[PDB]
C-alpha cells in the first residue's frame, strides 16, 4: 500500500491551493496565538515575582542595600535564605509597588484577550478553507464516476470503488483539518514551549523531555501486551455476530423445528464469553491514560522539588518556576495525542492517493455529437467479435437483423454471451472488429446520451435507489404526470401488488418490511423502462424471478402486440419464447441456429433438444 508518500502529500497539500489566502492566514494567525500562550506564563510570572520581591523584601531593615542584607543573613547563620535574597532583585524596605503589578497584569490581560481572538478567527478561517476543498474534491469525484467506462467498475472488487469515494474522502477531510489545526500548533507548542524553558532552566527541562521516552515506551508496552486481548475479542465478537446473523436470517427455521432454546442457550454462551474477553481488552486498553499521567506526575514531583530546591538557592526566581510549571502542563499536553494525530495523518494520506488514482484513471472515448435518430428501428450486427480480456473471445463472428416491427428472442445457456451482447448494443463496451448499426447508422458514431435514450433495457439484476416506488418508476421519465406513471405501472403488473402494500406507491424501497419481493423489484424495473416509451426495448432476463405467466403477459403486451417497437427478449424459460418470431439460439459466443418456432423446432437442432428438457 501507499506506493508513494511525497507526491501524494505535495498534491494533497496544493488541493488547498485555490484559496491560499485562507491557508496562509490560518498558519500565521496560529503562530501569533502560540507566541502568546508561551509569553503569557512568562509575563504572569513576572507579576507573581514582583509580589515575592516585596513580601520578603519589606521585612528586611529599611536603609540597607541588597548586598548588606545578604551579608547580614550570612552572618546570622542563614546559608540558604541569604542565597535566596541574593538571587532576587529586592530592595530592603519597599513594599509590593502595585503600579508594576497592575501594568504587568494589564499587559497579560490585554494579551490573553487577543490570543483568544486569533484562535477563534483561525478556527473560523480553517473551517471555511477545509469545507471548501472538500466540496470541490467530493464534487469532481462525482463528475469522474460519470466519465469512467463500465470496464472500470466491474473489474474492481465489490466495495472497492464505494469505500474509496465515501470513506477515503472522509479520511482526507480528517487529515486536511487535523494537520493545519491540531498538528501545526501542537508542534509549535512543543518547539516554542521548549525553547522558552531552556531559557528558564536547562536542568528542569531535562526532567520534562525524559517523559517523552518513558511515556512513549509504556504506551507501546501496554499496546503490545494487550495485543493477544484484541484478537481474543475481535474473533469472540465475530462468533457472536455470526450466531446472531444465522439465528436472525433463519428465524422461521429456528422458530419452527423448535430450536429456540438451543439457539438461545448458545447465545448465553457466546454472550458471556464476549463479556469476559471484552473486559480483558477494555481494561488493558484503558490503563494507558492512567499510566501516561503517572509518568507525567513523576516529572511534576521532580520539577516542583528540584526547581523549588533551585529557587531557594537563588539560581532561578520564584516567578520563573511558576512559568515553568505552566509549561510542564502545556508541553506534555500535546504528547498524549501524538499517536492519534499521526496515525490519522498516515491513514489520511494513504487514502488520499487512492482517490487521486481514481481521479487520474483514463476516462471514456470522447463521444460524438451526432444525436442518434430512430423512427423505425432496425438493429443489425455485422461480424461482432467482442472480448473482455484479450485472448478469450466472448462473441465470435455474430450477425443478426431486427426487421423494424419485430421481436427477436435470444435464448441459450448461461455464459453464451447473451448479456454481453446487450452491453454491446447499449455501447457499454466497444465492439472489436465488426459493425453494429441501429436503423442504418453505426452506433459507434453517435452521442451515447441519445442512443441510450432511444433504446431501453431491463437487466436480470435490478437497481432501485433510496425512495418510493413512485419515484423509482418515474425515474424513467420524470416529466410525467401521476396518471402516465400509473399507466406504465399497470402494464408491468406492479399496480397489482402495490395495493396490497401498507402505503403503495409511497412505500420506500430502502425502508420496507421485506414487502417487495425479488420478482417484484423486477416488475418495478420493467415499469421504469416502459414509462420512457423506448423504440428499441431489450428485456435481458428481467422477468426471471416472477411467474412464468406474468412473464408471458409482459412479453406479450410490451413486445408482440407493439407493431411499432423492435424488441429483444433474452429469456431462460424458453416456453414464453415460442410464437415469438425469430428465436436466435446462441452458444459459447456465437449463434448456432436461428428461425421461428416451427422452423427451428422441426429441424432437430439445439432448440429441439432444449424444448424437451422441461418435458423429459
Amino acid at each position: 500500500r501507499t506506493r508513494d508518500f511525497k507526491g501524494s502529500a505535495i498534491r494533497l497539500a496544493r488541493r488547498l491551493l485555490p484559496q491560499r489566502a485562507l491557508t496562509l492566514a490560518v498558519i500565521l494567525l496560529g503562530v501569533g496565538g502560540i507566541a502568546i500562550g508561551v509569553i503569557g506564563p512568562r509575563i504572569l510570572g513576572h507579576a507573581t515575582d514582583l509580589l515575592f520581591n516585596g513580601v520578603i523584601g519589606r521585612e528586611l531593615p529599611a536603609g540597607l542595600t541588597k548586598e548588606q542584607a545578604v551579608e547580614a543573613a550570612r552572618a546570622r547563620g542563614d546559608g540558604t535564605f541569604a542565597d535566596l535574597l541574593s538571587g532576587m532583585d529586592i530592595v530592603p524596605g519597599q513594599g509590593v509597588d502595585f503600579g508594576a503589578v497592575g501594568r504587568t497584569l494589564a499587559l497579560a490581560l490585554g494579551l490573553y484577550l487577543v490570543a483568544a481572538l486569533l484562535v477563534w478567527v483561525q478556527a473560523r478561517l480553517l473551517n471555511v478553507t477545509v469545507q471548501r476543498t472538500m466540496v470541490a474534491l467530493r464534487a469532481e469525484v462525482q463528475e469522474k464516476i460519470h466519465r469512467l467506462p463500465l470496464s472500470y467498475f466491474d473489474s474492481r472488487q465489490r466495495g472497492e470503488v464505494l469505500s474509496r469515494v465515501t470513506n477515503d474522502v472522509d479520511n482526507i477531510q480528517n487529515s486536511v483539518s487535523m494537520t493545519i489545526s491540531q498538528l501545526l500548533t501542537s508542534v509549535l507548542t512543543v518547539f516554542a514551549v521548549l525553547v522558552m524553558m531552556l531559557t528558564i532552566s536547562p536542568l528542569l527541562t531535562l526532567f520534562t523531555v525524559v517523559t517523552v521516552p518513558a511515556s512513549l515506551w509504556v504506551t507501546r508496552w501496554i499496546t503490545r501486551r494487550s495485543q493477544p486481548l484484541f484478537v481474543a475479542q475481535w474473533r469472540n465478537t465475530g462468533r457472536l455476530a455470526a450466531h446472531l446473523e444465522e439465528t436472525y436470517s433463519g428465524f422461521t427455521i429456528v422458530k419452527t423445528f423448535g430450536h429456540r432454546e438451543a439457539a438461545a442457550g448458545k447465545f448465553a454462551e457466546l454472550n458471556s464469553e464476549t463479556q469476559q474477553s471484552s473486559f480483558g481488552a477494555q481494561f488493558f486498553s484503558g490503563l494507558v491514560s492512567p499510566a501516561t499521567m503517572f509518568i507525567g506526575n513523576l516529572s511534576y514531583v521532580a520539577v516542583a522539588v528540584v526547581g523549588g530546591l533551585q529557587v531557594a538557592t537563588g539560581q532561578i526566581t520564584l516567578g520563573s518556576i511558576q512559568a515553568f510549571i505552566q509549561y510542564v502542563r502545556q508541553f506534555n499536553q500535546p504528547l498524549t495525542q501524538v499517536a492519534g494525530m499521526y496515525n490519522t495523518l498516515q491513514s489520511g494520506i494513504a487514502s488520499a492517493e487512492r482517490v487521486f488514482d481514481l481521479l487520474d484513471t483514463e476516462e471514456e472515448s470522447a463521444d460524438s455529437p451526432r444525436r442518434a435518430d430512430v423512427r423505425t428501428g432496425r438493429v443489425e450486427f455485422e461480424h461482432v467479435s467482442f472480448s473482455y480480456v484479450p485472448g478469450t473471445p466472448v462473441i465470435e463472428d455474430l450477425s443478426l437483423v431486427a426487421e423494424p416491427g419485430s421481436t427477436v428472442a435470444i435464448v441459450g445457456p448461461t455464459g453464451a454471451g447473451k448479456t454481453t451482447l446487450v452491453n454491446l448494443l447499449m455501447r457499454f463496451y466497444d465492439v472489436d472488429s465488426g459493425r453494429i448499426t441501429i436503423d442504418g447508422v453505426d452506433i459507434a458514431s453517435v452521442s451515447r446520451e441519445s442512443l441510450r435514450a432511444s433504446i431501453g433495457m431491463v437487466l436480470q439484476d435490478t437497481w432501485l435507489f433510496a425512495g418510493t416506488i413512485y419515484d423509482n418508476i418515474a425515474y424513467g421519465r420524470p416529466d410525467a404526470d401521476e396518471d402516465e406513471v400509473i399507466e406504465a405501472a399497470t402494464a408491468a403488473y406492479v399496480d397489482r401488488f402495490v395495493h396490497t402494500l401498507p402505503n403503495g406507491y409511497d412505500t420506500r424501497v430502502d425502508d420496507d418490511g421485506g414487502a417487495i419481493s425479488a420478482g417484484e423489484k423486477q416488475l418495478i424495473t420493467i415499469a421504469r423502462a416502459v414509462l420512457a416509451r423506448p423504440k428499441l426495448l431489450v428485456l435481458d432476463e428481467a422477468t426471471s424471478s416472477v411467474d412464468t405467466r406474468t412473464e408471458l403477459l409482459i412479453a406479450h403486451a410490451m413486445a408482440e402486440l407493439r407493431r411499432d417497437r423492435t424488441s429483444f427478449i433474452i429469456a431462460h424459460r424458453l416456453s414464453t419464447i415460442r410464437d415469438a418470431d425469430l428465436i436466435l439460439v446462441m452458444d459459447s459466443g456465437r449463434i448456432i441456429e436461428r428461425g421461428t418456432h416451427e422452423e427451428l423446432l422441426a429441424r432437430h437442432g439445439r432448440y429441439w433438444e432444449m424444448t424437451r428438457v422441461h418435458l423429459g
Binding site: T48, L51, V55, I56, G79, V96, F98, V101, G102, L105, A108, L109, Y112, W120, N127, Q131, V135, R138, I145, L150, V161, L162, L244, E246, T247, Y248, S249, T252, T256, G258, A264, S272, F279, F283, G286, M293, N297, Y300, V301, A304, V305, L309, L318, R329, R448, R452, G456, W463, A466, Y475, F497, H499, T500, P502, A515, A532, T548, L552, S575, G616
Partner: protein, 574 residues
Amino acid sequence: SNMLWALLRQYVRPYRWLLAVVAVLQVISNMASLYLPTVNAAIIDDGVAKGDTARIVELGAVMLGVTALQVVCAVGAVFFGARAATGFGHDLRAAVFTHVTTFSAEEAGRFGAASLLTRTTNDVGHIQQLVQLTVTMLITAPIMSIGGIFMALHQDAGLSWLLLVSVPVLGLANYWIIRHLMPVFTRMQSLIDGINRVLRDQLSGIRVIRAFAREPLERVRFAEANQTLSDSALEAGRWQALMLPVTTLVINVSSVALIWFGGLRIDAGQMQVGSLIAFLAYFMQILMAVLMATFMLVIFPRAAVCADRIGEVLSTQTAITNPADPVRPAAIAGDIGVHDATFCYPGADRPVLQDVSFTVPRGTTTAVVGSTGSGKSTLISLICRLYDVTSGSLRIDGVDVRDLDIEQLWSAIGLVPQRGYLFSGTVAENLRYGRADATDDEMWEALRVAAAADFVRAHPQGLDMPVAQGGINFSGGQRQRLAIARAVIRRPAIYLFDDAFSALDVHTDARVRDALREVAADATVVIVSQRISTVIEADQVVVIDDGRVVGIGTHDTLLADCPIYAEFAESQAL
C-alpha cells in the same frame, strides 16, 4: 435523549455498586492530583520562603506518596468502570436478543435480518462505549471543578470566591455552546449518512443511470447533498470554534484576576505567596479536564440515534402468542380447513388473501398455484401461525389454529419455506434438526428420499461434509434438497412445501415427490409452486389470483374450467 436515558437507567441498574465505587475512586484520583500543587505551595512557603532546604525533599516525599495514590486508584477506577460498562451491554444485547426471538415472521421482517443484527451487536456497542467513557473520562470535568473549589476552600478560603465565579461561568458559557451545537451536529450526521447513500446508489446502478441518460439528473441530486452537507458542517464548526477560545479565555482571565486579588491579600499579610502557585494549577487542571471532556461529547448524539433503534426493537410487542388455555389433542394428524380466511397488512388497500376457503383432507395432497405476489407464501405462513388471520379461520382437525399451543403445532409440521436456510456446521447437524435424536440409517434414508444422498455420500467426510454459514457452499438444488431432507427426518403429519422444487429439474422433482408420497403416504402435503408439472398429480389443485380463489379441482377438470389455469399451463408449453 429520552430513549438513551430510559435504556441507560434500566440496564446499568444492576451495577450501581460498581458505579458508586468508580465514582469514589475518581474523586480520590482527582483530589490527589489537585493535591500535588497544594504540597508544591507548601514547598514554596515552608521551603523556598525559608532557608529550610530539608523541608523541600521531606515534602516531595509526601508528594511521591500522593502521586502513587493517584495512580493506584486511577487503574482501580478503570477496572470497575470497564466491568460495569461490559455488564451493561451484556445485559443489553441479551435483552435485545431475547426480545427479538419472541417476534413473529411479520414483526421480525419489518426490521430485517441485517438491520436487526447491527442493532444488537455494534449498536449496543455504541452505548457500551458511551458508559465506559462517561464513567472514566467525563465525570472528571464535574469532579475536577467541584474538587478544585473545595481545594481552593481548604487552602486560602478567602480567595476561594474566584473559583466560585469562574467554574459557573465556565460550565455555563460552555453549556450554551453545546446546547446550540447538539442540534446542528445531529443534523450533520443524518446528512453525512445521506450523501453516502447517494454515492452508494450511484455506484450500485451506474449502468441503469446511464441506460436512461440520468447523469444530468444525477450530480444535481448529488450537488444538493454535497452543498447541504457543507452548509450544515460549516455552521456546526462555527459553534465548535468557540469552545476552546471561550474556555481558555475564562481560565486566563481568572488567572490574571487571581494574581491581582491575591497580591492584594499577600501584601496585607493574610495570604502566602505559594497559594498562587496552587490556584494557578487548580485553574489549569480544571481547564484540561473541561477541554478533553467537551472534545469527546460527540458520542452522545451518535449513541442516542443508536439507542433509538434498540428502543424501537424493545418497544415492539408481539401479536402472535400461545393462548391462555390451549387445546392439546392426542396427536395433530393434519386436516387443514381454511374457512373464509383473509389477510391484509395494516393500512393496505387490498388484502393479500381474501375470502379464501378450501379444505385439504387427512391423507391427501393439495397444491396451491398462482402468480407472483398472489398470496401463496402468505397461506403457508397462515397454516402454521407465522402470520395471523384477520377475518377468517385456519383449522387443523377441526380446532382453530389460534386455539392451539403454537409449539405443538410446529412439532407436527415439516416446513420447507421459499427463503430456506442451512445452518453452519455439518449436514448431519442440519438434519439432526427436525428430529434432534436421529440415527444414521434415518439421515441416509431421508437423504435418499430427498434425492440428496448422491452428493453427500460422494464426499470424504461422509454425512459430515461441512456446510458454510448460509449453506452457500451448495448449489440451489442441493441447498433446497437438504431443506427437504431435514423436513423428512421429522416424519410430520403435515408437510408444507413453499416453492421447494423450483431449482430442481423435472426429473429429480418427480423423483423426490414419488419417494415422498411413498414413504409418507398418510401425511397431508401442501405444495406451493409456480410450476405445473409438480401439480399434475396433486389430489386437488386450487388456483389463487389477486388474493381470491379462482378455481378448485384436479389438473384435468381445472385445465378446462379455469381460464387462468389454462393460460398458466400454456405459458409452460404443456
